[PDB]
């Protein structure tokens, strides 16, 4: 037996930006899906495409674990078929997998302001893509000036803000089931 490293994915000290999330291929292991189901340390925990309770006794070829940080009210944009700043710029309607989001004020928001999303893009992001801005006729040559600006506003996170204005860490469980050999079930 060789347990899957879901502990170090959910318990990673520092995550990445929403525009630069880290896809994490997890395979060749055994996943105890009951840990995620019965932790109670998760603000939001929902999905479709697979039975959440009976997901334990099913295996797939590989497991993909997205990981990024968004605001409290922006957790709605991490669902299939959603419109928003994060959804359209930073999951397909046939997504089979679960999205797990929890509160991370004490770890991403500091008293002085850690300040460690993408606001502008000509084309909306196609599913499972990740992008790492001309707003007029003026073809700016690389100077962030008139009608041209940086496409990245840094997040502002402090413990003083409200529930939906606070940082949230999101892990998306993306199960793929290609015709290869499945290797991850408990």
């Amino acid at each position, epitope marked *: *037996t*060789n*347990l899957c*490293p879901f*502990g*170090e*994915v959910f*318990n*990673a*000290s*520092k995550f990445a930006s929403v525009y630069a999330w880290n896809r*994490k291929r997890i395979s060749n292991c055994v996943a105890d899906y009951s840990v995620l189901y019965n932790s109670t340390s998760f603000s939001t925990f929902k999905c479709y495409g697979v039975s959440p309770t009976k997901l334990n006794d099913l295996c797939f070829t590989n497991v993909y674990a997205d990981s990024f940080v968004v605001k409290g009210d922006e957790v709605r944009q991490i669902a299939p078929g959603q419109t928003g700043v994060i959804a359209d710029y930073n999951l397909p309607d046939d997504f089979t997998g679960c999205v797990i989001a929890w509160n991370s004020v*004490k*770890q991403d928001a*500091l*008293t*002085g302001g850690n300040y460690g999303y993408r606001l502008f893009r000509k084309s909306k992001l196609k599913p499972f893509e990740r992008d790492i801005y001309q707003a007029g006729s003026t073809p700016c040559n690389g100077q962030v000036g008139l009608n041209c600006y940086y496409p990245l506003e840094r997040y502002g996170f402090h413990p003083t803000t409200g529930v939906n204005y606070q940082p949230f860490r999101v892990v998306v469980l993306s199960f793929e089931l290609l015709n290869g050999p499945a290797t991850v079930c408990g």
Partner: antibody
Amino acid sequence: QVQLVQSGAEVKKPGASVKVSCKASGYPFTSYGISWVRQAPGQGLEWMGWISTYNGNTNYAQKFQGRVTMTTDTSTTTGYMELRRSDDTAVYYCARDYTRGAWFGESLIGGFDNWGQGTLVTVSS
Amino acid sequence: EIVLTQSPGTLSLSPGERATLSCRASQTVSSTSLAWYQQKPGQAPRLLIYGASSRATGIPDRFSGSGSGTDFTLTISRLEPEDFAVYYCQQHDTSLTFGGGTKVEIKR
């Protein structure tokens, strides 16, 4: 209820190396890493290194870059530690690591838990 | 490196008093990569706090840790007879660094 047990006290001269075993039982041995801390008598804790029980990668401290060697056996759930002086006379501790991750290698939310009893190593001519 | 400077080196409080042990870093350590360790004399180190605020399983409630940025503090709300030991702070933001220790002595 996991316990880590180390080897008995072994003394040497300021020549060759001493080796300490550390067998754990109670957790998946390849799920959590192992760390080593050195504490001289009358002194505090001094970190030595870190090892991954899944991939085998080692992150030794800056002091022991070129002296210490760490290996673990996946079968016996045992982690080994070897330091290739009288200055190093101390008690070597073995602990379960939750700060660097066993599979990937990223910093985690945790510390060192379930320490061993500590192997007494004295080096004197 | 990031150096953890603890002060005072030796603390003296009678049983029942409130203890406020502090750990200071030479740089800015992430609020997650900092752990407190208690070591009773003649025994092994015991994990108290991880993430600078979260206690390890089995640790009592009187051991509450806090801090952020460069200044961090471990607080023992009600000192108990077994709480008199040597305490350390450890950060793994940049490699790994321990502290000099803070012995908690019985005042008489």
